[PDB]
Design a protein around this ligand. Sequence first.
Ligand SMILES: O=C(O)CCC(=O)N[C@H](C(=O)O)c1ccccc1
Ligand SMILES: O=C(O)CCC(=O)N[C@H](C(=O)O)c1ccccc1
Ligand SMILES: O=C(O)CCC(=O)N[C@H](C(=O)O)c1ccccc1
Ligand SMILES: O=C(O)CCC(=O)N[C@H](C(=O)O)c1ccccc1
Ligand SMILES: [Mg+2]
Ligand SMILES: [Mg+2]
Ligand SMILES: [Mg+2]
Ligand SMILES: [Mg+2]
Lengths: 367, 367, 368, 367
Amino acid sequence: MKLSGVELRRVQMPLVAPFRTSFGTQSVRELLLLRAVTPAGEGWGECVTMAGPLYSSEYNDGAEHVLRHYLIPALLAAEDITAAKVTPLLAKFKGHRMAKGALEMAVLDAELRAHERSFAAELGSVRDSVPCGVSVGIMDTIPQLLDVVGGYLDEGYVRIKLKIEPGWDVEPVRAVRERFGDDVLLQVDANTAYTLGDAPQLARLDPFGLLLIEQPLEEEDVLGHAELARRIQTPICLDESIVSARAAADAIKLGAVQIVNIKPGQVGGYLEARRVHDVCAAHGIPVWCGGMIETGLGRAANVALASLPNFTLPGDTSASDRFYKTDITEPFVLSGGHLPVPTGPGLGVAPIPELLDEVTTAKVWIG
Amino acid sequence: MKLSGVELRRVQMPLVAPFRTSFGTQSVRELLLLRAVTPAGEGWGECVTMAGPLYSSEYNDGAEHVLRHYLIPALLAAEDITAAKVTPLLAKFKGHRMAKGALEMAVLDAELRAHERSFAAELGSVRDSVPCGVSVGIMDTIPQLLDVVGGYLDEGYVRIKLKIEPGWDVEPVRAVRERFGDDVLLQVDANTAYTLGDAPQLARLDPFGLLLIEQPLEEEDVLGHAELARRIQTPICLDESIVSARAAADAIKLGAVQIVNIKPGQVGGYLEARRVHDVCAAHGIPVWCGGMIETGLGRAANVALASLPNFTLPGDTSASDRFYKTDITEPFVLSGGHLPVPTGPGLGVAPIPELLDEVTTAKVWIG
Amino acid sequence: MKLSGVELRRVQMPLVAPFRTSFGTQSVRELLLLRAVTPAGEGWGECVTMAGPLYSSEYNDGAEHVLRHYLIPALLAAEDITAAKVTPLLAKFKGHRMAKGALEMAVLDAELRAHERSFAAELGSVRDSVPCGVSVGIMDTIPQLLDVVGGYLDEGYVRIKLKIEPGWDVEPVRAVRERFGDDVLLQVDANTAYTLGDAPQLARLDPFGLLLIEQPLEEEDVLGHAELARRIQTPICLDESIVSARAAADAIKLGAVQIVNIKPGQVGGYLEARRVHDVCAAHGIPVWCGGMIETGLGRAANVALASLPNFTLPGDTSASDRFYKTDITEPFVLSGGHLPVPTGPGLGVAPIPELLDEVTTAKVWIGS
Amino acid sequence: MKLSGVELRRVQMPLVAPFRTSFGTQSVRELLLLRAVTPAGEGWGECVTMAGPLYSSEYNDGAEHVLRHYLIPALLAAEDITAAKVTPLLAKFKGHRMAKGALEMAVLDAELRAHERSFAAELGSVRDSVPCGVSVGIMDTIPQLLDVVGGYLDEGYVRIKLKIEPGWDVEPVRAVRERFGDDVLLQVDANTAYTLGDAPQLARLDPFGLLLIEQPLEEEDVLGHAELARRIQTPICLDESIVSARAAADAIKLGAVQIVNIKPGQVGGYLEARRVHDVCAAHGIPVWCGGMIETGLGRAANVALASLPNFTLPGDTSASDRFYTDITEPFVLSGGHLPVPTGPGLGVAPIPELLDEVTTAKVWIGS
Ligand SMILES: O=C(O)CCC(=O)N[C@H](C(=O)O)c1ccccc1
Ligand SMILES: O=C(O)CCC(=O)N[C@H](C(=O)O)c1ccccc1
Ligand SMILES: O=C(O)CCC(=O)N[C@H](C(=O)O)c1ccccc1
Ligand SMILES: O=C(O)CCC(=O)N[C@H](C(=O)O)c1ccccc1
Ligand SMILES: [Mg+2]
Ligand SMILES: [Mg+2]
Ligand SMILES: [Mg+2]
Ligand SMILES: [Mg+2]
């Protein structure tokens, strides 16, 4: 396979409801989409960067620049290209895992469509549907949270994940546990908002039987997470820190993590994502799939990934209408708390051209 | 697809020269071959068991029985099969990794042929050819050994591996180093033939700068290998002990292994073999591909596997003519110390019926 | 003080000689300069990013973008500004340590000039001049390397650092040792080019008595460096991995490093650089100052930093004419293998406008 | 800058009420004050030594002697001095951290005023006010204590700290918890009064939700503190043991401490105090600022220091009217907080009428 070129497309899609996290409230999602063109056909990738560098150092403009001037040219200059060979060819470029992963996603989509093989087949799926949780952001009031959580439970989601913050942590959890019982799968995500010194306060969440606390401390404080694991009873889940299979290996060796959140864009592609799943499986560490408010493209790839054997916890693979009234692909519709693994070649979904054009704010061809 | 059936075939192929290890001399390789047939097409698998349970608990007759009465029936009874689902379907059957791996190899060959995809593509190859070492057995004299080793170096092999045993260790290595110099990649394999108490004698191998010592102690004495690593300087390579990705993870955690020999049949298939490669890579542990005097079928899958990124030491992926004057497939011919990674769909090679029938001693159809 | 604005100036400076490292041969150094303007006066900062993201994830264009659209706007919106408050104000922007460090450098220059205090005073200098080593890149032949090393020793540099790479390691070190003796302070830098599996080959460096092997493995493989340290004899020095005081603390706790290279831009500024120095001092770990082929501006701040008490090994603070025939500032001239710590307010140095304009390829004003 | 001289002053100041700790009952605080004179201006330093060697080996008379005959001469003999060079210049004198820290304090005030820069600026303050706790000494009865702490809570203090001793520990804590509730920030300090053999009693303090136990065992028993920390559940805080940044580093490496009390005079000055803050911060260890019943001079420097980012627990930086009247502008509590001074240097200076009023001795060491 020789890479003919890549179309970078900048897309803006409005959310049905604002989503508030430890670093801001967002009403519209700005995305970066890649259409890789090979003699065999087209392939699509999605970048999980956002407008600004508030979640990680990568953001849309920087991803677009590094892709346009380094990564895509490097692949275009290669004598032969395959999805597996993408990593060695872009290795001399330090960092930029989300851009690399988006590019690899597009390459792998094209490659697999050429072989009439799905992402689920290539990654090694063993399930035909995946159980799906939902991630509920920070709310302004407690009743407002209880209402949103009850609505999502009525829709059939099998797990609730609450974004927590200093000043908004023990109370919601208590409110949700009191109104909805102890049998609901409940977990929290802190987005690096705490410090090892906040260990007593986080221990106040022990009686509520959460499945996990996701990334309480800073991205690079792996040892601090191992220390925190000794002081609380809720299992520690790492997200922002898990950027590679080697990173998961090291965090496990150090006792810093008991459950791993695999974000394919964050680890540099779905291939590395499978590798993270595999090392965690070898060490007895459960994994689940993380979300980034993706379109149907990334959502489809994520459902494929989430059907692998060591995904023993429901992922952040919600339905399309949880974020978008109109997805740019075939919509993902919740059925009994589950999503069906796509079966078509490649991603099993593709942009609907009229819908994609209505949300396209920019496009450029690199060739 | 749905598995339509499996042709189980017993093959007897004579070796160019006897091959002697700490547990016996092999002169005729008795093998078990599998032909899986689906509506999509054919696939070939090879079992690496031997006639008797001298290397492991698995042997040809026992493999045939467990395949015929448990594994193949279980796969035939599934509504849908994929190479990835072979492991969950055969999970209720404890053990029998080599038979399972052969069955998976045949299913995967058929699956990949249906998609016109090579083993190298599915496993994640990054090289078009692999560098090849050779494994030299125990000899009667030192001059014999020196002549055989020089003959293999003149053929262009890039690494020499010496089978060692009590009474045949320090002297052959000294002889090889004195006759051929310090630049030859040299390593030894003992096949569990030593004991922790023999640690001083193995330390007598320190001055010669071997790459590794392969399986000094027994299959289950992993802790003993960690102790041996504290007592000797030559890096320790585990073979018979590496039966799964979890086994490798555990041995790495215990400081029992610094280089891993991946034998796909021994770990239960090529998919598990890739998982072992990935687990080792996350821990900084180099891997290389192991041999079992396979035919061109297993040899082709081995070359594919050995082209993955963390196979950073030359494997036991020798040419066909080091073992067989003919071989049942298109031969693997050494060119500049390298073997070319097959590019055809599936294994990229298939049996030549004329030759295969000449060496078949039994065949049965299970469907 | 409120920041009135920042001038971003892009500069292109030709090198006296090519400089080759594990990721390329460089003939011209492309730089970012920041001119912070406050009611009290001016301050200068320098970014240590390079043209492309070959050394780290940050590169010139990306640094300029994040500065222009996030960091400088964030500071302009601050009611009160001090160099110390730069870190909390930019905390919500993850990463971009080199851009942040350049901005903090400019703010700190302005603040210290407003208070008539030098960088050396603010950082805690204890000596008036610093000893200087030199970093020599990969060469084409061994004789070329021997000639360059002898020439640099004749200039009076007190330490030699050789860029090493797979295939160009044991031989250059053996050659330098044989010709120039056992008393030359010698050390090597690999720029992440090796792997734990390459441990035997790096052990072949054990007899030549190097001070350190700098960053043999990847940035994020800290455990791998501790394990290499168990298998070899030369002390392990971390460079690319030391991005913060917390990073240094963790590497020391894990046994991954015995000597730390402090690159102020790499850790996000000179205040964090001091913090790294203090952490390493508290654990008995020597530090030395790292270079990024900076102008006289970054060089002045670097010698100031390198005059702190725990910088007990010569840093990559070479003289100006080692890289540039004409520095944009007053030059730094080697005197007996030392450079003098500036004494003026702030950096103790400022760009000479005729010289700076000759090498300026772009400039933009971001302001209120 | 060339030190012109230092005026040594003995100050005797009445406390609002006696203050009792496990090492004695206090009725008047005798202190030692320093007036450094440089050509650029004046600076004031305070020594935290007390009348006798009851808290540490340093006491007022001995501090004055080592200053008058060794430390001040050494600084006077120097061509150029800066606050930073004070430590290297007095380094050949083993020990005497409190005297050196006071001398450094005065030199730094003079230096900072000469550059019209505050202490908070040099140290790197990021907050304009700091939250203040109060330290309550041993009382004669349980109700007597409750009146004192309730009065301190009515004044607006945000944390209550109780001095403990053999015979005064579980009971005062139970009383405060039941009378004043579970939301009061409460901690205890033993001043080395217990042993590892007393570990059982200190385990009885676990149910009441204290923030920490300050210095249970002797200053030099760091290992015993790590042994204790395994055995009890309330966090361990070290005070007397933290005498340098290297000492905090060593205690953290040994697991002997999770919260550090930074006493600038005890660690040898405010510069070292900042270094201790930075070391703990790099290790994820919260710090808080400690008091030594200082005047407004030490109180101003302590408030500045306590406004650095890792002071995440309210320090012993109580209001001036908790002990005194003060020889500077009093520090008046506002909503449980004190304001960080903004003037040059300390931002405060003695009011001559009040300073002379309490001065018992004066001597000039100079040129
Ligand atoms: O369902 C979805 O798509 C979202 C789930 C989600 O919260 N993703 C991550 C996280 O776990 O931090 C995230 C990342 C950035 C902002 C907000 C959230
Ligand atoms: O090139 C080849 O196929 C041979 C390499 C080799 O020695 N394989 C293994 C081993 O490591 O014990 C083996 C195991 C059992 C019998 C014979 C060999
Ligand atoms: O003398 C100087 O300024 C340079 C010294 C030096 O080598 N700096 C670093 C390094 O350590 O790799 C570096 C980083 C990137 C390119 C080239 C060098
Ligand atoms: O509020 C204040 O200034 C005092 C707080 C305090 O108790 N300081 C220390 C200590 O922690 O042991 C101390 C030292 C000497 C005597 C009495 C107390
Ligand atoms: Mg998360
Ligand atoms: Mg073997
Ligand atoms: Mg370096
Ligand atoms: Mg105390």
